[PDB]
């Protein structure tokens, strides 16, 4: 149960969604970009916290923040 | 002259007073 907030500085480069190993992010239509897209995080209980989405965001001081919060059984990735 | 045999036990029961007053306060601070 992390918190992946997306800010208005996205450019719809789509790179944050590809890096996510757990499919938390996905693109929705938007208008504040030439791409007309913005990241959204509908599945954040699945967020593992790897911040691999933040490494891919190219906007300077990146538009997507993982906010490591209450860690549960699927946000810590336990197979046992 | 060291303290007598009984004076040790007097301290034992006297120190039982702050022993319970610690329970008074630890549980009142909602452990």
């Amino acid at each position: 149960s992390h918190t992946v907030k997306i800010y208005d500085t996205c450019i719809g480069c789509t790179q944050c969604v590809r890096a996510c190993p757990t499919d938390v992010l996905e693109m929705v239509p938007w208008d504040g970009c030439r791409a007309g897209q913005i990241a959204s995080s509908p599945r954040t209980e699945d967020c593992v916290g790897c911040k691999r989405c933040e490494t891919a965001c190219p906007t300077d001081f990146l538009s997507i923040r993982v906010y490591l919060g209450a860690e549960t059984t699927r946000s810590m990735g336990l197979a046992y | 002259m060291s303290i007598s045999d009984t004076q040790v036990y007097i301290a034992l029961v006297v120190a039982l007073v702050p022993g319970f007053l610690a329970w008074r306060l630890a549980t009142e601070l909602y452990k």
């Binding site: - | 060291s2 303290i3 007598s4 040790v8």
Partner: protein
């Protein structure tokens, strides 16, 4: 000397309380203190 003794008054009292607070009481205490940290909030 070849024994633990006490010149101090009530020298029998370390004889029983050093075993008590150090290897007789803690396992009851660590059990009580275990039952408290692992109780359901139902």
């Amino acid at each position: 000397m070849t024994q633990l003794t006490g010149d101090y008054a009530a020298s029998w009292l370390p004889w029983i309380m050093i075993p008590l607070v150090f290897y007789i009481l803690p396992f009851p205490v660590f059990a009580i203190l275990f039952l408290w940290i692992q109780k359901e909030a139902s």
